[PDB]
Amino acid sequence: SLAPEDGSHRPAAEPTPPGAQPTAPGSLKAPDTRNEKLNSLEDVRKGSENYALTTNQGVRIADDQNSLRAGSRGPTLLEDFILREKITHFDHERIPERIVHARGSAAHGYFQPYKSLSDITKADFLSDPNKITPVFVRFSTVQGGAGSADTVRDIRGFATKFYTEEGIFDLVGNNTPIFFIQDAHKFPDFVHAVKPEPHWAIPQGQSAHDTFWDYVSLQPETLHNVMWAMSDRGIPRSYRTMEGFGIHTFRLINAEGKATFVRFHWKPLAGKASLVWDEAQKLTGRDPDFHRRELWEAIEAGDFPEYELGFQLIPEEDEFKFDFDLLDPTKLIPEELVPVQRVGKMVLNRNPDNFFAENEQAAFHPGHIVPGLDFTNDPLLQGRLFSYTDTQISRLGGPNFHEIPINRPTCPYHNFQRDGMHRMGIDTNPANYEPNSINDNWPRETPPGPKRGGFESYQERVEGNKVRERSPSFGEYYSHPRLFWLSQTPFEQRHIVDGFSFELSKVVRPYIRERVVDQLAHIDLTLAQAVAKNLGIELTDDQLNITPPPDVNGLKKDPSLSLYAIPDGDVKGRVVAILLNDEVRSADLLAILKALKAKGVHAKLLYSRMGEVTADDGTVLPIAATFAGAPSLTVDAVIVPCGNIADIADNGDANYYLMEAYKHLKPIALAGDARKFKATIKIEEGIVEADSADGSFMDELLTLMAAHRVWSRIPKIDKIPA
Amino acid sequence: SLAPEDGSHRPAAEPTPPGAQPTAPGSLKAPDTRNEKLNSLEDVRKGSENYALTTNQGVRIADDQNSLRAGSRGPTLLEDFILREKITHFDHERIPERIVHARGSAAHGYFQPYKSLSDITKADFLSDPNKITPVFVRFSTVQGGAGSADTVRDIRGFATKFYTEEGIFDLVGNNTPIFFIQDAHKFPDFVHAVKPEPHWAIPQGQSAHDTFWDYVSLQPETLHNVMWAMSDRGIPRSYRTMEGFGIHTFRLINAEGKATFVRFHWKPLAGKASLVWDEAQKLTGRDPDFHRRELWEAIEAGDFPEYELGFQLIPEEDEFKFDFDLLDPTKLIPEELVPVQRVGKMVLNRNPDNFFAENEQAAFHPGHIVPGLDFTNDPLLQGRLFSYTDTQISRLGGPNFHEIPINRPTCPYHNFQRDGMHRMGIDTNPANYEPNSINDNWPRETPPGPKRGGFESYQERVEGNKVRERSPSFGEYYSHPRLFWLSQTPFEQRHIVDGFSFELSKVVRPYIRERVVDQLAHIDLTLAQAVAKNLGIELTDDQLNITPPPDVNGLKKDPSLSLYAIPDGDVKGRVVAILLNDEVRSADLLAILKALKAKGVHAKLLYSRMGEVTADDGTVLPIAATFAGAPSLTVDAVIVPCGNIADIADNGDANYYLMEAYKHLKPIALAGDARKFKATIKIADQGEEGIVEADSADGSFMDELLTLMAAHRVWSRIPKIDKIPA
Numbered sequence A: 001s002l003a004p005e006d007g008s009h010r011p012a013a014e015p016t017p018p019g020a021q022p023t024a025p026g027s028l029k030a031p032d033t034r035n036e037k038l039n040s041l042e043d044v045r046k047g048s049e050n051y052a053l054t055t056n057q058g059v060r061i062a063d064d065q066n067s068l069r070a071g072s073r074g075p076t077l078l079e080d081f082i083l084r085e086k087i088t089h090f091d092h093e094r095i096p097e098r099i100v101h102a103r104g105s106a107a108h109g110y111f112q113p114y115k116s117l118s119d120i121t122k123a124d125f126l127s128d129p130n131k132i133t134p135v136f137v138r139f140s141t142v143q144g145g146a147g148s149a150d151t152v153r154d155i156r157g158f159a160t161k162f163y164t165e166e167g168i169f170d171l172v173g174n175n176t177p178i179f180f181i182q183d184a185h186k187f188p189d190f191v192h193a194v195k196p197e198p199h200w201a202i203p204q205g206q207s208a209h210d211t212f213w214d215y216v217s218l219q220p221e222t223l224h225n226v227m228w229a230m231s232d233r234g235i236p237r238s239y240r241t242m243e244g245f246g247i248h249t250f251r252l253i254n255a256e257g258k259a260t261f262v263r264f265h266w267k268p269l270a271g272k273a274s275l276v277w278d279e280a281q282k283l284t285g286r287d288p289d290f291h292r293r294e295l296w297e298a299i300e301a302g303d304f305p306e307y308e309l310g311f312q313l314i315p316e317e318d319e320f321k322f323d324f325d326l327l328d329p330t331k332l333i334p335e336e337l338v339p340v341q342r343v344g345k346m347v348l349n350r351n352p353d354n355f356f357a358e359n360e361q362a363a364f365h366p367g368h369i370v371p372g373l374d375f376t377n378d379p380l381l382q383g384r385l386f387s388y389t390d391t392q393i394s395r396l397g398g399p400n401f402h403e404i405p406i407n408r409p410t411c412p413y414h415n416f417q418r419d420g421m422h423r424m425g426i427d428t429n430p431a432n433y434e435p436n437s438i439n440d441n442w443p444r445e446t447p448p449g450p451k452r453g454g455f456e457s458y459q460e461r462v463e464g465n466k467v468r469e470r471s472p473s474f475g476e477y478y479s480h481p482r483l484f485w486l487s488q489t490p491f492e493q494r495h496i497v498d499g500f501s502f503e504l505s506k507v508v509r510p511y512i513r514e515r516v517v518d519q520l521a522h523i524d525l526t527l528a529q530a531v532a533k534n535l536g537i538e539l540t541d542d543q544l545n546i547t548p549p550p551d552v553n554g555l556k557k558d559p560s561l562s563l564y565a566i567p568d569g570d571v572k573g574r575v576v577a578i579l580l581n582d583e584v585r586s587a588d589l590l591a592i593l594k595a596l597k598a599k600g601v602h603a604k605l606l607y608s609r610m611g612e613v614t615a616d617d618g619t620v621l622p623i624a625a626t627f628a629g630a631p632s633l634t635v636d637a638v639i640v641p642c643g644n645i646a647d648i649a650d651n652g653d654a655n656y657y658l659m660e661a662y663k664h665l666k667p668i669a670l671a672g673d674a675r676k677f678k679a680t681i682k683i684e685e686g687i688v689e690a691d692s693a694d695g696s697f698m699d700e701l702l703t704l705m706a707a708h709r710v711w712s713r714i715p716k717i718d719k720i721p722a
Numbered sequence B: 001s002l003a004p005e006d007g008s009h010r011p012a013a014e015p016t017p018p019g020a021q022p023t024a025p026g027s028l029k030a031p032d033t034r035n036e037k038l039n040s041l042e043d044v045r046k047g048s049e050n051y052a053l054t055t056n057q058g059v060r061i062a063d064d065q066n067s068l069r070a071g072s073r074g075p076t077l078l079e080d081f082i083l084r085e086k087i088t089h090f091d092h093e094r095i096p097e098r099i100v101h102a103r104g105s106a107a108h109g110y111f112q113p114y115k116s117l118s119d120i121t122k123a124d125f126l127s128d129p130n131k132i133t134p135v136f137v138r139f140s141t142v143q144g145g146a147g148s149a150d151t152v153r154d155i156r157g158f159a160t161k162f163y164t165e166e167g168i169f170d171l172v173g174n175n176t177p178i179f180f181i182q183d184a185h186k187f188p189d190f191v192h193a194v195k196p197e198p199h200w201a202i203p204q205g206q207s208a209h210d211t212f213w214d215y216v217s218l219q220p221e222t223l224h225n226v227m228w229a230m231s232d233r234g235i236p237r238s239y240r241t242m243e244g245f246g247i248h249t250f251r252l253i254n255a256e257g258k259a260t261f262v263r264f265h266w267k268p269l270a271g272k273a274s275l276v277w278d279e280a281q282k283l284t285g286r287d288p289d290f291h292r293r294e295l296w297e298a299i300e301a302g303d304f305p306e307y308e309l310g311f312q313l314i315p316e317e318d319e320f321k322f323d324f325d326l327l328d329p330t331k332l333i334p335e336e337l338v339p340v341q342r343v344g345k346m347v348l349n350r351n352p353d354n355f356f357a358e359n360e361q362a363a364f365h366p367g368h369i370v371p372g373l374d375f376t377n378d379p380l381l382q383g384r385l386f387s388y389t390d391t392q393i394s395r396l397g398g399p400n401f402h403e404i405p406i407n408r409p410t411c412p413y414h415n416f417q418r419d420g421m422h423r424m425g426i427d428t429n430p431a432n433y434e435p436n437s438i439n440d441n442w443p444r445e446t447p448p449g450p451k452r453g454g455f456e457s458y459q460e461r462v463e464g465n466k467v468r469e470r471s472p473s474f475g476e477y478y479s480h481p482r483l484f485w486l487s488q489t490p491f492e493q494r495h496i497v498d499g500f501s502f503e504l505s506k507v508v509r510p511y512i513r514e515r516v517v518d519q520l521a522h523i524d525l526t527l528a529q530a531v532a533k534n535l536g537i538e539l540t541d542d543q544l545n546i547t548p549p550p551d552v553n554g555l556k557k558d559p560s561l562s563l564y565a566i567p568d569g570d571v572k573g574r575v576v577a578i579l580l581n582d583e584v585r586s587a588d589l590l591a592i593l594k595a596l597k598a599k600g601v602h603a604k605l606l607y608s609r610m611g612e613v614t615a616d617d618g619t620v621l622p623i624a625a626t627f628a629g630a631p632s633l634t635v636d637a638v639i640v641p642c643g644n645i646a647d648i649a650d651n652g653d654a655n656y657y658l659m660e661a662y663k664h665l666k667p668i669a670l671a672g673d674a675r676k677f678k679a680t681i682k683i684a685d686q687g688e689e690g691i692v693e694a695d696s697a698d699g700s701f702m703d704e705l706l707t708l709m710a711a712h713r714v715w716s717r718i719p720k721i722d723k724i725p726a
């Protein structure tokens, strides 16, 4: 036996905070967490304990350390079938990554509606509040490879697979309410422009390069989503603290055949929160797996990601009642005009067992709808319908990808389709065609109806000539970027300006920067002038006289477009770094940890080395990580208790820890002699201080944490050397 | 026409320094750089200028902005074949990445031997000093995906494809002289242990996790290469500044049939240089493409990466004369016992045109040998021979991967092999078998001979039973790690201690840390105690009394194992950040730039914004990047000229730029009023070694800075950096 006698190799099969135990496969960590889909995967789960090591043919292996050779120093023999099977499997492990959204993190969960929506849709999963639908959700970046970093500046994907009683419904959305382009025909152009440049395959996970900004400068339809990407929306704190959107206008179909236009929303119940750019970029280096880690550990801790599904509903007769086209995916529907109606709740409560088998092989596709839903003529959605089925043929090696366990429906599926690579199902039907008499025509067609009926498309009126032509109604590119801009707080506006300025500073060809500044002048002159100033560009008199674009249906702002204008902070699941010293004041630590526990905030005890330190009262404190090992980038706030401050006062890493946290607008709390640290960080805003840590001290810190970041600190942070 | 009238969209087709022009495909940047392989690729190069946009079937496209629909707001029609072809191609762009070494950067070049090696090998590419062999080289990491970062702590791959007149020879090596494991059967175990853990697929490009250290703690054969990985060898400054090794003992076969044992080496003519850990980790975030970029830009600048091929030669009769087994890939051959003999030079002088077509699709395999070379029974090499052919079947979609242009030999190839997915060659031979009479048995076998002969294996004696058994001669795991350790400078030793300490601090299960510390106690007690102290572990009395391993054939050290013990610094191709102000003293800048240019050192002019600034004499200075946009991590040294220092004195990014460079041991030079920055980095009025200072940027100032740059980093500053909060 190679396991330690104390059993410290095995994580506790109960909820534990981040860092407390090694992470584990979901069905070992949380064995009692179940749903219909998780149970249906039991047929393919493979254990390991007490089993013999074998070949894939079931032959027991005696020596898994050596190849078969002619003498102990001899050549390896071709008859070593064990070696060749092992190496062959290894040699063929990889499959193509997703063309886009290759970097992603996933979890299992469930969805339940608040009330029946039978009045507006016949979709079974929305028919009854007691109807629970298992889900599998994958969050992702867009540009980067599967080996790229999490905290890049990019759009994020938010894909949900609903295992309904009437079929798989995939809600394949993003974290912004619009897309960059209007027509699917341009998707390869846009994606090629943002992806690493063809000659040298640089840069990874970054849109800050010539080809991206060249395309943007030449395609003003891109400007709306570019605004969102340049904002702090492009750098979420966690997948738990971002919004989700279906983007396209879809249809709901009820039993009477009435169509209602709908746009889908996911509201994070943990609130909206993003990083700041320097923090995000440095985090790609210190922890490229930050979001994947945070998601996994939140679930292991019982801090389940929760989202509320919401619908913006528009009657069919209101199709033309807006200043923009409902079918234009570069346009958002302001919540001030059409509110989001709460529909139900989704809870992600279990991680996968095997990342490759469940996450990598998962196939989501927006064409996977169910009776009660339908499409629209949105020309981006229209092209997506082709792409997802297509790509899955090579990525997942054939037309039987629905037979890969994670992708399998939980409801019945029977048809006349046969064969294909890796065919799992053995069909016993004497017939492989219909109509047939030899099997009494089974499986049979089902007419459409109120429940358990066949799929029938909504009989939308089609009138026109066969044209490859963009609707003139789509030819407005600046009003939604302006609405977005004006809805942001002054600090959010600054971060947008900084995002554009940083990105355009990496564009080698100056004329491209100039062309982008010209586009910005069509959105807002304050924005354009601020970016131009940072690039050493002067706006022309013509540029200064560009008439701003029209309001959107009389709106000059919509606060729902800001991350922070309306506070929605929640501290549960956040993490605090506690900077230890070799003689901690135990009274401070007791008070700190008790207050954090009460609010479900986690703590990580940090020091200059690993192991343990002893407090003033003899309490042995185990160290989670070093100051360098778990930088401030990975936490939400920093607390420094009193004690032997002289031990860490001259520690460069401890001082820098606070300077970085300060720069990145994080709350900092200093008790007793820890207040000596104020001077070393050049000092202000959001610094909690007192003689000791108590109720008052901790309440103040937790109030700051609910506000996420100390925005009031921004005016002089430029001057701080960190 | 969408291009600017001034033609500023197009790079100059001449050598230009990094950042001066946009980067470009190799055949457009350097059209006059040629070799037999590059010329042979002309049949597949596709241009673009002046051509109509078409489908893959040659049909001209009229509107590439829209799908075909029934009305301008109507549904997309299935008959839009243009849209479906475009989307189909897009949907199927990706191929599987390499299982290992997925992250890599490549270039074209050439090799030439110094003299004929006909006496020791009949390999045609080594037969004549005037015989030029084109090469294609790919450098890589091991663990990370194709989208992972360059400056991770890892082993680096160094793969060379030699397009010889007698076949492709692939020299598939790494940047360390040994591997982690002994037998190929364990490769999936080792790789699975270092790779992201299976449940959650974390961490990327990092060995700092439980499963890796669990495997290491249970498999002491790994300790030697682990030592190299934990050292600064694991974080090279550039692919130009690392060594290369074949690792395995191979054979050279001459015309008389004599076998000589050989180990292959690549000596970087730019010298050995590595980053420091904090810098390397931060660089993964600030520029994950740092090495790929540096390689591409060095070639575009005319700073061609050069390497000297060298051989360690051991006569057949000396097989057993060492304390270690020659066939053991976890053992190195000390240069003090067997010197590296200079063989030839390789120059990388042209970048690819299309990364996917040339780099991603390149297939290297150590089994691709030529007459004059042969294998040995090294059990790691033996298994490699199976793997490379095998993996290429799925990665490159079939058995015709040699037909992918980059992989094609330049010499003739004819055989009876037919068909297979994406078969390019159309065979006209009436026969697809041999022996045949219908084509008079052509193509024909060729007997082995001195030149242009068929391949015949060296008739090595085989004696033994069919066994899955490790040779007892391989059962020594601590002497080579100790030899390596003792060969390092004190600062290199500190960096190794820090490497282990950092990595083990990320291992969740404490017992694994304790088990690794126990292994270290079998190598060197100073090393073990220093790592233990950083982990809050106490060594037991038994651990303190472990007898050190034996010397390696009487050697206690070998300085050839250190990066820095023997100076080999070269400043050409290095880069200096110049921190500008809004009224630069032009006299300082003229002197600075002229001195750097003369030594082939590049400069990047930095400021708080993009655009231009004007010097005191009206000279317009173009800004390459901002202080935040091009951090100190990306440069080798920092110079601050005089002028209006008040403009940047309070700039947090400018101050931090210097603090970061200081912590990372980089030379810093301050002219005139720029000396006010000494307060940020806590330099005394009397100065400090490694900080160049003067009233102006005169003759002595630049010479002092360049002397510091030739020494790479200011090691003497190490005791001073701990106090700096950066």
Ligand code: HEM
Pocket (backbone or CB within 6 Å): A098, A099, A100, A101, A104, A138, A139, A140, A156, A157, A158, A159, A172, A173, A174, A178, A179, A184, A187, A246, A247, A248, A329, A362, A363, A364, A380, A381, A383, A384, A387, A388, A391, A392, A395, B087, B091
């Ligand atoms: C509103 C615009 C879009 C959104 C929100 C979006 C979102 C996503 C997301 C989140 C994924 C990854 C899902 C996963 O596998 O975890 C993805 C994959 C993909 N998307 Fe989209 N997408 C958009 C438009 C497009 C368009 C216009 C096309 C092509 C016409 C396209 C083609 C694809 C393909 C081929 C993949 C990979 C699908 C796969 O291999 O599973 N996407 N998209």
Ligand code: HEM
Pocket (backbone or CB within 6 Å): A087, A091, B098, B099, B100, B101, B104, B138, B140, B156, B157, B158, B159, B172, B173, B174, B179, B184, B187, B246, B247, B248, B329, B362, B363, B364, B380, B381, B383, B384, B385, B387, B388, B391, B392, B395
């Ligand atoms: C002695 C130490 C080893 C060295 C120096 C070595 C070196 C390398 C290098 C440089 C590459 C990248 C080549 C490229 O750019 O395509 C590579 C790829 C690879 N190596 Fe090794 N390797 C070693 C041991 C192993 C072993 C034991 C195996 C398993 C038999 C192995 C399997 C592979 C595979 C399957 C790939 C990628 C396959 C491919 O080229 O498509 N290597 N190795």
